[PDB]
Design a protein around this ligand. Structure first.
Ligand SMILES: CC(=O)N[C@H]1[C@@H](Oc2ccc([N+](=O)[O-])cc2)O[C@H](CO)[C@H](O)[C@@H]1O[C@@H]1O[C@H](CO)[C@H](O)[C@H](O)[C@H]1O
Ligand SMILES: CC(=O)N[C@H]1[C@@H](Oc2ccc([N+](=O)[O-])cc2)O[C@H](CO)[C@H](O)[C@@H]1O[C@@H]1O[C@H](CO)[C@H](O)[C@H](O)[C@H]1O
Lengths: 16, 133, 16, 133
């Protein structure tokens, strides 16, 4: 519940 | 590495990256679209020099990435992103880097890559992608 | 437009 | 193979799949959530039978998949999905099948798998996943 819009994020690929 | 996060935009106009035949992806910078305007993303640079610059200029908005792929693997010995290829509905840019290690791919049937985030030190340590309709 | 809602799809993995 | 597409739902309650340790994934079937109620997806069955059934029952809604991975490889002259691993926030399920060929993985940082589609002949040929916030 905040004012920052959100998007799907896929990843990460690479280190931890 | 230095964590970077571009956040999310309207689409991708251009990718500037550099690489080394012997090691890995080094620099990464994106020119996004932001509501019809080129948005020049911050150049996220390697800590070291020696890389071959590549410029991937897209025919926005008609041309768009359909698959990101590459290899991750050990370099002096940090797990890093050794290799990248960007395939769009028009063409295939790459591979750039060393195509050795563990292959990965993200193909997209519906949706658009709208941001990158990750971390870079000597080399691109890891990355993620924002996806949107 | 269409009357059908849309969703992000990633893939396919396997036979290309 | 015979193409399938579940569409999109609210989330995942259970995955029922089958495999054989010599070949590849055979059947695939999902119990979705639909607005807080289970929805039984179609069972996508191989043309042949004899695979070892597996039931992955998640503690929905607190448990959800964070990564899907496995291998694609050739079986009797076909490229098929040879193995799958489902990693939730609580544990790992797999691998099931055979871990030979070309690895792939979809890690998710933000969002939910909410549907599957693909094709199955003698084995799972390919699949894709619907992602949502
Ligand atoms: C930022 C930093 O202190 N290190 C980076 C850098 O690491 C080196 C250091 C020395 C040499 N060398 O003299 O040949 C090579 C690399 O690059 C790495 C690969 O690009 C990492 O970015 C490393 O950061 C460390 O990365 C590991 C990740 O595997 C872990 O994240 C550490 O916390 C982080 O410092
Ligand atoms: C639908 C079909 O005719 N074949 C399926 C089936 O193929 C066989 C056939 C024989 C044997 N065998 O002797 O042990 C195994 C499998 O299963 C395949 C793998 O599961 C494919 O699904 C195949 O369909 C064909 O698949 C290829 C893709 O690899 C292509 O899409 C063809 O259009 C399709 O017929």
């Amino acid at each position: 519940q905040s004012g920052i819009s959100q998007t799907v994020i896929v990843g990460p690929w690479g280190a931890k | 590495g230095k964590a970077f996060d571009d956040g999310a935009f309207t689409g991708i106009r251009e990718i500037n990256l550099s690489y080394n035949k012997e090691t890995a992806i080094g620099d990464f910078q994106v020119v996004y679209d932001l509501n019809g305007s080129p948005y020049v993303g911050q150049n996220h640079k390697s800590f070291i020099t020696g890389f071959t610059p590549v410029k991937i200029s897209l025919d926005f908005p008609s041309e768009y990435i359909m698959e990101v792929s590459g290899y991750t693997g050990n370099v002096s010995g940090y797990v890093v992103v050794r290799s990248l290829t960007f395939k769009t509905n028009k063409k295939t840019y790459g591979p750039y880097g060393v195509t050795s290690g563990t292959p990965f791919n993200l193909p997209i049937e519906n949706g658009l890559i709208v941001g990158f985030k990750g971390s870079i030190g000597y080399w691109l340590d890891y990355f993620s992608m924002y996806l949107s309709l």
